[PDB]
Amino acid sequence: MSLQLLRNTRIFVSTVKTGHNKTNTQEILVQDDISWGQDSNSTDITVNEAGPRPTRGSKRFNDSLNAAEWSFSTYILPYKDKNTSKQIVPDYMLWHALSSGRAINLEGTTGAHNNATNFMVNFKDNSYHELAMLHIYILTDKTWSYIDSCQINQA
Amino acid sequence: MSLQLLRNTRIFVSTVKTGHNKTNTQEILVQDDISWGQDSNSTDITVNEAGPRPTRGSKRFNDSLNAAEWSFSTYILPYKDKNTSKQIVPDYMLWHALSSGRAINLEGTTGAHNNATNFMVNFKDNSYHELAMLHIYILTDKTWSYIDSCQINQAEVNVDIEDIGRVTWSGNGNQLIPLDEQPFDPDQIGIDDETYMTIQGSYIKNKLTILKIKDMDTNKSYDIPITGGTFTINNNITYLTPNVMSRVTIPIGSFTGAFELTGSLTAYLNDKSLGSMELYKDLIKTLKVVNRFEIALVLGGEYDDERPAAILVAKQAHVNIPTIETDDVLGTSVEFKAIPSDLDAGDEGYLGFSSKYTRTTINNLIVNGDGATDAVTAITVKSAGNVTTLNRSATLQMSVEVTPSSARNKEVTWAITAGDAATINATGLLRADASKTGAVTVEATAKDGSGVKGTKVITVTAGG
């Protein structure tokens, strides 16, 4: 018995559906304009006669579900973390899933990779039919939910 | 011919239109700031053309009737009636209408209801689309006039030093109606001189204003002298009217909006511990979106002898970040708004009006909810046989005593805070074992939330 407010939403970005730790999931600081959902398709079958006393009745069938839509806005907030002493943006896995389709490796030289000087994102390794795969976890007040196998369409 | 005068106008509040008796009508202690009247909406039609002969024409039409406006202020003078010997404010159905929409019932537990000790008004049953329906009767000299189906929009309570305790009511009615015939004789319904003496026996002076402020995340009660305050209860009532072109229309019922209990308290900055400055700096330091505070404003002061006082009890309030106001001597203002435990759980707050308050009475009203039910004040944990220590691997069922002996809730919890060499259960059986050579403590706090503390340092030793 409770109502859920949008202001209490918290968003976590994950690459795994189990074994969640600090290297696979981090919170993403979102704003008011956050939105998510999933629409469904249907169809009406109607009989179209021409004579007197025609049949006037319809019928609906659920036929398919559309892809889930999500969107949110975040501040560009570069900083250096104390653990690794390398400049990193908090929503770095979002940048990686946008940039390349390989497993995340900040030590490398393609996609989202950081350094002791700056955090860098290059698109030299995005030749993939399925980029790095995320799972957006949504926490509104008390109830949980998530979108399965997301992909970063744009930024 | 005969001119009607304002000073001779008397107000009567009713719950029914016919068969008015003493239990449905009363004379209200209104002041000289009364005002009422119903206005109307009108439409003007103009014509704009470009021809050689312009049509400078204007046609007016009446469209609808707006809500009837009424507003008056009354003195806060709680008292006990001789018939029931229970403390009741003279204008009790006004508080009932402000509180909940059920039938008036002083013997219940929701809405405006009295008791042998004090009159308490909760808003626990306020979750209605339409509150209790009244009928404001206005007798100016001899001509009668009443406002149909009034509902209390807000109650303006002003709490300022140099100002006597008063409350201002403002609401709306479906349609003000003038009457030629007397609905009921005012003399026997109007209060007699004896109950006027009884009412004037109790005055509430706002000069004696003491505030109880306490955060529920730190339990840092403050000592704040009040310079002046104001808290109001708002129903956000809007009347719904139909839109018909052919004929005029009148409002039809209403839907109470969002319940708002806001208040503003002005107080001088103090450098003393638990003062205004400490509260301000704590609030401006711990910038948190949500606040949870015990605010208990006590109009009229507190005394050992029975004294008239007015009480507001906001259990879980929201304190807005104060803005220190510059003046001759620094006096800050704090704004609060009581939020509920859950949006539809009620319990926004409750009030206390009575001429007979002892500090214990107001204390148990604040903590337990009623001025009649007693609450624990001090607790000393009692060992099973005046025992002071314990040896390794020995059982000890803790007992406890509570005061006063007339407390309604006497059961306490059992917990261990300082030291890790023993355990305690729900009943209080403290148990030790081997490898327990350190001193440990035991705690006890009642579930009524008085803030009582039961402590005793038991010297748990290694044993023989």
From Swiss-Prot, chain B:
Localisation: Virion
A Pfam family annotated for this UniProt entry: Big_2
InterPro entries, alphabetized: Big_2 (IPR003343), Invasin/intimin_cell_adhesion (IPR008964)
GO cellular component: virus tail; virus tail, tube
A Gene Ontology BP annotation from the UniProt entry: viral release from host cell by cytolysis
Region Disordered, annotated ranges: 40-59
Domain BIG2: 375-453
UniProt entry keywords in alphabetical sequence: Late protein, Viral genome ejection through host cell envelope, Viral long flexible tail ejection system, Viral penetration into host cytoplasm, Viral tail protein, Viral tail tube protein, Virion, Virus entry into host cell
Assembly and interaction partners: Homotrimer. The tail tube is made of 40 stacked trimeric rings. Interacts with baseplate tube protein p140.
Function noted in UniProt: Polymerizes to form the tail tube of the phage. Tail tube protein polymerization takes place around the tape measure protein (TMP-pb2) and is probably directed by chaperone proteins. The tail tube is involved in viral genome delivery during ejection.
Domain comment as written in the entry: The C-terminus possesses an Ig-like fold of the Big-2 family.
Protein's UniProt name: Tail tube protein pb6
Designated gene of the protein: N4
